[PDB]
Design a protein around this nucleic acid. Structure first.
Ligand code: CL
Length: 52
DNA sequence: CGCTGCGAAAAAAAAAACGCATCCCGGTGCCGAGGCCGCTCAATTGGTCGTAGACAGCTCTAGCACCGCTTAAACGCACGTACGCGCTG
């Protein structure tokens, strides 16, 4: 019943959920692994901080 | 005479005066950030299905050594010429 947001499970502020959707609806591939969005929201957050 | 000293005279160069532009100080005032209000649709859960990819091997390619013959490049040096380089008007 209690739904923790994946972004929390990675300790990322970047939305690992919205990254997963954007990828599947991006037409990048047929199938997205479940680590991929994590890995990507991570890298995104990181470069966001590096500039900020 | 030469030396010299000075007295320009000539720039140097300095300094200093002028005036101009760039900074900064401190109080206006304006607008857009930043923070609340609800609310709606996109993320989560959990759970079913079916197939992408991990593995365990089987093949035969094609990539890595070795090896002298035969050249055509490389190395290299010497001589000389055309070019790059800098100053002035
Ligand atoms: Cl993954």
């Amino acid at each position: 019943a209690k739904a923790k947001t994946r972004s929390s499970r990675a300790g990322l502020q970047f939305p690992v959920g919205r990254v997963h959707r954007l990828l599947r609806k991006g037409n990048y591939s047929e199938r997205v692994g479940a680590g991929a969005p994590v890995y990507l929201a991570a890298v995104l957050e990181y470069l966001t901080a590096e500039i900020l």
